[PDB]
Design a protein around this nucleic acid. Structure first.
Ligand SMILES: [K+]
Length: 290
DNA sequence: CCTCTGCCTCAAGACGGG
DNA sequence: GCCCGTCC
DNA sequence: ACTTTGAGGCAGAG
């Protein structure tokens, strides 16, 4: 994520956030970070202090969450493509099992060379999907034209679906993508440190005036705002600006009919899900394809 | 105003019966 | 609708 | 990660 970026946009560029009804997204395609969704299911889907599992002790919380959340999206007319991270722990077995489930459900997935969010952003840039459905605002820093929050949130949570439009953010802040990347570094990114004493108000002001972190460092008073030693801001800038990403043209994205017979063998025979519940889910999925 | 830091509170997936 | 036990 | 974890809201110092 980017520390304080969503709050900043709401505070200073609220017109960049559009809130629309779920019905308005019927038929839209979205990219989703599979690795993060697996991680979240391992945390959320718990019983008695442990993940759901079959009698052999093999985890199934990830399968449970992926199976029903995907069906709910398709019931809303939203077609997801899942993006797996490239180069509580998400294991290779978790990924392989979720990929197997997705293939049997007829849901496309892709392997990112590196960051899943950056490859999600690349898919939106190429027009392959409408938006990245994520809470990670760094997807904007990777250049995603549209980010959508709370798309999969249950109705009970009463969280409105929010579209963040990158072009509007840049227009309101008066910045280009390169300057926006430097601003996100000053706000606080996973890749490198931020300058102590420089928060969201001063970072926006300094980026608008000086236009680059390099220029900012020269202008700043070293005594008042010392930078961290061996600051990797040039490296982080490059990771956001030119990330290693998949080729959106490489793989054709297709949503196909689920394979109920194989889903029963895998989810019920092996993973010991209730057959009644799996068949009910498959029927909802088939109905949503209409 | 602005940015910390420390203290605090509470959500964290989906389903289905009542 | 919500509450809350259960899912595996 | 619910016999825990962590993100965010708040108040006040500097
Ligand atoms: K800082």
């Amino acid at each position: 994520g980017i520390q304080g970026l969503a709050k900043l946009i709401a505070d200073v560029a609220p017109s960049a956030i559009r809130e629309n009804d779920i019905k308005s997204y019927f038929g839209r395609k979205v990219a989703i970070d599979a690795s993060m969704s697996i991680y979240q299911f391992l945390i959320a889907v718990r019983q008695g202090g442990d993940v759901l599992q079959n009698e052999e002790g093999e985890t199934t919380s990830h399968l449970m969450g992926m199976f029903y959340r995907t069906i709910r999206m398709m019931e809303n007319g939203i077609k997801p493509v899942y993006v797996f991270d490239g180069k509580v722990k998400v294991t290779k077995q978790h990924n392989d099992e979720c990929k197997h489930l997705l293939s049997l459900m007829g849901i496309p997935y892709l392997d990112a060379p590196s960051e899943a969010e950056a490859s999600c952003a690349a898919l939106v840039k190429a027009g392959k999907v409408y938006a990245a459905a994520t809470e990670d605002m760094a997807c904007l820093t990777f250049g995603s034209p549209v980010l959508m929050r709370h798309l999969t949130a249950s109705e009970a949570k009463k969280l409105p679906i929010q579209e963040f439009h990158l072009s509007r953010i840049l227009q309101e802040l008066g910045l280009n993508q390169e300057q926006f990347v430097d601003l996100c570094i000053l706000l606080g990114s996973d890749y490198c440190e931020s300058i102590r004493g420089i928060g969201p108000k001063r970072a926006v002001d300094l980026i608008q005036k000086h236009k680059s972190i390099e220029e900012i460092v020269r202008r700043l008073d070293p005594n008042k705002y010392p930078v961290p030693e061996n600051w990797l801001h040039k490296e982080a800038h490059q990771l956001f600006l030119e990330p290693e990403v998949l080729d959106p043209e490489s793989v054709e994205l297709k949503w196909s009919e689920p394979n109920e017979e194989e889903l029963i063998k895998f989810m019920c025979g092996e993973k010991q899900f209730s057959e009644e519940r799996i068949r009910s889910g498959v029927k909802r999925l088939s109905k949503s394809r209409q």
